[PDB]
Paper text:
ERα contains structurally conserved globular domains of the nuclear receptor superfamily, including a DNA‐binding domain (DBD) that is connected by a flexible hinge region to the ligand‐binding domain (LBD), as well as unstructured AB and F domains at its amino and carboxyl termini, respectively. The LBD contains a ligand‐dependent coactivator‐binding site called activation function‐2 (AF‐2). AF‐2 binds the signature LxxLL motif peptides of coactivators such as NCOA1/2/3 (also known as SRC‐1/2/3). In the canonical model of the ERα signaling pathway, E2‐bound ERα forms a homodimer that binds DNA at estrogen‐response elements (EREs), recruits NCOA1/2/3 (Metivier et al, 2003; Johnson & O'Malley, 2012), and activates the GREB1 gene, which is required for proliferation of ERα‐positive breast cancer cells (Ghosh et al, 2000; Rae et al, 2005; Deschenes et al, 2007; Liu et al, 2012; Srinivasan et al, 2013).
To overcome barriers to crystallization of ERα LBD complexes, we developed a conformation‐trapping X‐ray crystallography approach using the ERα‐[name] mutation (Nettles et al, 2008; Bruning et al, 2010; Srinivasan et al, 2013). To further validate this approach, we solved the structure of the ERα‐[name] LBD in complex with diethylstilbestrol (DES), which bound identically in the wild‐type and ERα‐[name] LBDs, demonstrating again that this surface mutation stabilizes h12 dynamics to facilitate crystallization without changing ligand binding (Nettles et al, 2008; Bruning et al, 2010; Delfosse et al, 2012). Eleven of these structures have been published, while 65 are new, including the DES‐bound ERα‐[name] LBD.
Residue numbers in the entry:
A (entry chain D): 686 to 696
B (entry chain A): 305 to 461, 472 to 548
C (entry chain B): 305 to 461, 470 to 548
D (entry chain C): 688 to 696
């Protein structure tokens, strides 16, 4: 699923 | 993993260097606060702190070696514990008060501005006082905060995380032997510190429920990020 | 204080001698399961355990030196953590199952008989798996359980200073045990930390369980005992 | 309070 947390962790 | 090869001193510096910055709140000096305004300030602050927390987490030795899902799990589990122990740490030199931000230093009675918040404030204030009386050092603090990150979600999943957890214990002990504490004082203090993590868990769970209620009460719009971190606990 | 005079071995012996018994459930394996019946079983069991727990706490060194008000508070704080760590201890040699009573051994699918209970079962099972992993000893278990009694409500209250002194004595005890087991100084501190970190998750389970229990009370599917209701209301 | 009573005796 889309997760703002995913983005922050990957960035 | 790279974390296990690190020495104790190297571990302390790595953690110390990963520390997030102390963010500010809004400079509107209108007092007192309303419920909505205090709620707005707290949630706005936590929102911005969360972004830095993720940066901090990725710099906690061993955390990058975890899959993305594991990282996500640990952070979703521990995020409020981590905000709170940081809050409590910052508030240590301000007895009777919570230093949410340098321009947002709140006493006990200001917790009354939000219903059910004063109970959470009292628990945080007691935790800060406990840290004060233990003369908690910054090196111990960062070790504890890393323990929370790695430990709180590890039983809701192993060896790698637990090896790193062992590494921090070693690091904690190393710090205490450094301060001249005797062997008996060393494990006694270790125990005292880790037991406070149980209260931090309790506070986080109390805070999680309060946040959830405020979501349902719809007093203040919560960010998608904060909502998602919150959704992970229901 | 007598608690401060006990040696490590004397501490272990006192804690072991104070162990509550393992109660049976009113469980009848002939009448299958409903949400109301299992909840009945679990709460009935807890109610009976609670009486033993209260009399056990009096035998925990240092606990009798506290004011009555402080005793009430500690037990009100810790009662479900203590029930849970006992449960996890019992279940340690039953992989995948929770031994609530010798005649009531449940895996997670039965936990689905009650709404949201399976989440709690899973956490308890993971904790039992953890104890199994660590080869947790009974001597260590009784130390941890008394730490929970004294520690969980200590931050929500001279009186505390006494408690922290007893807590320290139990730390001394845990370490003495590990040194006897042939563990190195490093291994002692690592195991010590490992044991105390589990208490964080035990707090978490109690917190969730308390909320689940409160919701069932409002759901009103099975009569909770007077004592359980009072304990439950002590968390609100 | 039941707990109080049970603690007393
Ligand atoms: C306890 C207030 C709080 C939060 C985090 C969002 C909160 C806010 C409103 C609630 O109803 C419950 C908790 C928090 C915010 C920033 C920190 O660094 C630490 C704690
Ligand atoms: C997890 C079920 C439980 C309880 C304690 C009453 C429970 C029951 C129903 C709920 O909705 C929540 C918790 C319990 C009972 C006895 C034990 O020795 C340990 C745990």
């Amino acid at each position: 699923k889309h997760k703002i947390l995913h983005r922050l962790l990957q960035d | 993993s790279l974390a296990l090869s690190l020495t104790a001193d190297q571990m302390v510096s790595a953690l110390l260097d990963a520390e997030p910055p102390i963010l500010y709140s809004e400079y509107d000096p209108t007092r007192p606060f309303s419920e909505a305004s205090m709620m707005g300030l707290l949630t706005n602050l936590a929102d911005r702190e969360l972004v830095h927390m993720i940066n901090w987490a990725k710099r906690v030795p061993g955390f990058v070696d975890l899959t993305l899902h594991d990282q996500v799990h640990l952070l979703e589990c521990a995020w409020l514990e981590i905000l709170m122990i940081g809050l409590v740490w910052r508030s240590m030199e301000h007895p009777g008060k919570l230093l949410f931000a340098p321009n947002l230093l709140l006493d006990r009675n200001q917790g009354k501005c939000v219903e059910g918040m004063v109970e959470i404030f009292d628990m945080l204030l007691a935790t800060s006082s406990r840290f004060r009386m233990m003369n908690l050092q910054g090196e111990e603090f960062v070790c504890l905060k890393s323990i929370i990150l790695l430990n709180s979600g590890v039983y809701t999943f192993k060896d790698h995380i637990h090896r790193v957890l062992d590494k921090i214990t070693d690091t904690l002990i190393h710090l205490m032997a450094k301060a001249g504490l005797t062997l008996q004082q060393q494990h006694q203090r270790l125990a005292q510190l880790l037991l406070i993590l149980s209260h931090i868990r309790h506070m986080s769970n109390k805070g999680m429920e309060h946040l959830y209620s405020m979501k349902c009460k719809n007093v203040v719009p919560l960010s998608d990020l904060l909502l998602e971190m919150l959704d992970a606990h229901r």
